[PDB]
């Protein structure tokens, strides 16, 4: 819950998934 390991792994894996979704959305933008 408040252990150091959980806060770490999470605080570096949530933005990764958010950004990956963002890039996948970017892949279909048309000029």
């Amino acid at each position: 819950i408040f252990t150091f390991r959980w806060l770490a792994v999470h605080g570096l894996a949530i933005p990764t998934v958010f950004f990956l979704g963002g890039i996948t959305a970017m892949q279909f933008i048309q000029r």
């Binding site: 958010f18 979704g21 963002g22 996948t24 959305a25 933008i29």
Partner: protein, 76 residues
Amino acid sequence: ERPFSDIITSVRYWIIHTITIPSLFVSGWLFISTGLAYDVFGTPRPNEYFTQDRQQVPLVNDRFSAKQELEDLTKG
């Protein structure tokens, strides 16, 4: 304790992840699709590099009056 080889097997981990991860992925997709990023970060859209009046590259040319200069260059 309980090293990773045990987490990658427990079913509660699987159910909480299957309910949590797609929400974040869809949130990122919607963040890009709705056009909010262009507003948050100021990135020009593919049809906003040159306006009808300005046909040149808009380089900032002042230090202490950057706000007014950027406001004029953006739309005005």
